[PDB]
Design a protein around this ligand. Structure first.
Ligand SMILES: Nc1nc2c(ncn2[C@@H]2O[C@H](COP(=O)(O)OP(=O)(O)CP(=O)(O)O)[C@@H](O)[C@H]2O)c(=O)[nH]1
Ligand SMILES: [Mg+2]
Length: 307
């Protein structure tokens, strides 16, 4: 019997913000690591494992939008980062691109994780357009470096947050919606790893769908009542915040969880929704979990790659 260790690593300010909010929300059987140049922010981290990088370079401050300093800071702390990762089967690196620490250190952290043997997923943001063209260009270089370092990459352009708020939505509430991409994906994978299914998927199947793939989508949908399977599948692949939509996916892992009422017909319905939206012949890895505690609820988990 295999017991997969999942870790979430926040790098720089936004990444550590996400880690803090995820710890506050409550996650279990996931270990958190906080990496930053910024010593004051690290003192505020709720993560059990904290790594201050680059103290000789920044004297405990952030990198001040210099990504070469973020990169050197991470490289010079490689052994400490290795030691914190060692044992992970899967690592999610989350970071905001555009500054110095995230842009520069997050790709180094991802490279170290993949070298340490972890299946490595990046979930990163691109800056708001109001932050200007130079920030966007610097962020794009970070995204390209992340993509070269990870197994799979999910990019959230922060401009998409402007599509889901009204004029009064608090900034912190918008940021929590972006956090959910990472948090729900980690949770869905954790649940898949842990909970035996009637058509069982496990961590090896996650490795197959994600290893050395590039862009990815991770989504969960929940619905009930009539058309629940179709509605849950549509929610799983809906991507108001994602740079990489479902369109073009050539590989999909889809797990359906439901109660004893889960029908063969509705499972096919859900699978067809996903394949129709991808508009490709999708290589599906299909799973099913019967949770009898569920009554009318259905949960569809999707990981899509092969773009
Ligand atoms: N969605 C989201 N975006 C964030 C958040 N914090 C920062 N951002 C975005 O990430 C980008 C990088 O900010 P930050 O993570 O603080 O950068 P850093 O590299 O640690 C700062 P320095 O350059 O001084 O080292 C910001 O420009 C912004 O677009 C957050 O909590 N949520
Ligand atoms: Mg700064």
């Amino acid at each position: 019997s295999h017991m997969a260790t999942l870790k979430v690593i926040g790098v720089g300010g936004g990444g550590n913000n996400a880690v803090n909010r995820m710890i506050d929300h409550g996650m279990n059987n996931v270990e958190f690591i906080a990496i930053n140049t910024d010593g004051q922010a690290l003192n505020l981290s709720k993560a059990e494992s904290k790594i201050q990088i680059g103290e000789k370079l920044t004297r405990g401050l952030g990198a001040g939008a210099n990504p070469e300093i973020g990169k050197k800071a991470a490289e010079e702390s490689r052994e400490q980062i290795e030691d914190a990762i060692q044992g992970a089967d899967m690592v999610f690196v989350t970071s905001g691109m555009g500054g110095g620490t995230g842009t520069g250190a997050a790709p180094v952290v991802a490279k170290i994780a993949k070298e340490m043997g972890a299946l490595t997923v990046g979930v990163v943001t691109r800056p708001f357009s109001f932050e200007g063209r130079k920030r966007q260009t610097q962020a794009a270089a970070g995204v390209e470096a992340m993509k070269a370092a990870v197994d799979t990459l999910i990019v959230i352009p922060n401009d998409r947050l402007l599509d889901i708020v009204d004029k009064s939505t608090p900034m912190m509430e918008a940021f929590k919606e972006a956090d959910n991409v990472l948090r729900q994906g980690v949770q869905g994978i954790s649940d898949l790893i842990a909970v035996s299914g009637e058509v069982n998927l496990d961590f090896a199947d996650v490795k197959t769908i994600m290893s050395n793939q590039g862009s990815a989508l991770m989504g969960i949908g929940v619905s009930s009542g009539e058309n629940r399977a179709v509605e849950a599948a549509k929610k799983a692949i809906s991507s108001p915040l994602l740079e990489t939509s479902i369109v073009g996916a050539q590989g999909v892992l889809m797990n359906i969880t439901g109660g004893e009422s889960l029908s063969l017909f509705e499972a096919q319905e859900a699978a067809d929704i996903v394949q129709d939206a991808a508009d490709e012949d999708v290589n599906m890895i299909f799973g099913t979990v019967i949770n009898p505690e569920l009554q009318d609820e259905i949960v569809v988990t999707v990981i899509a790659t092969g773009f």
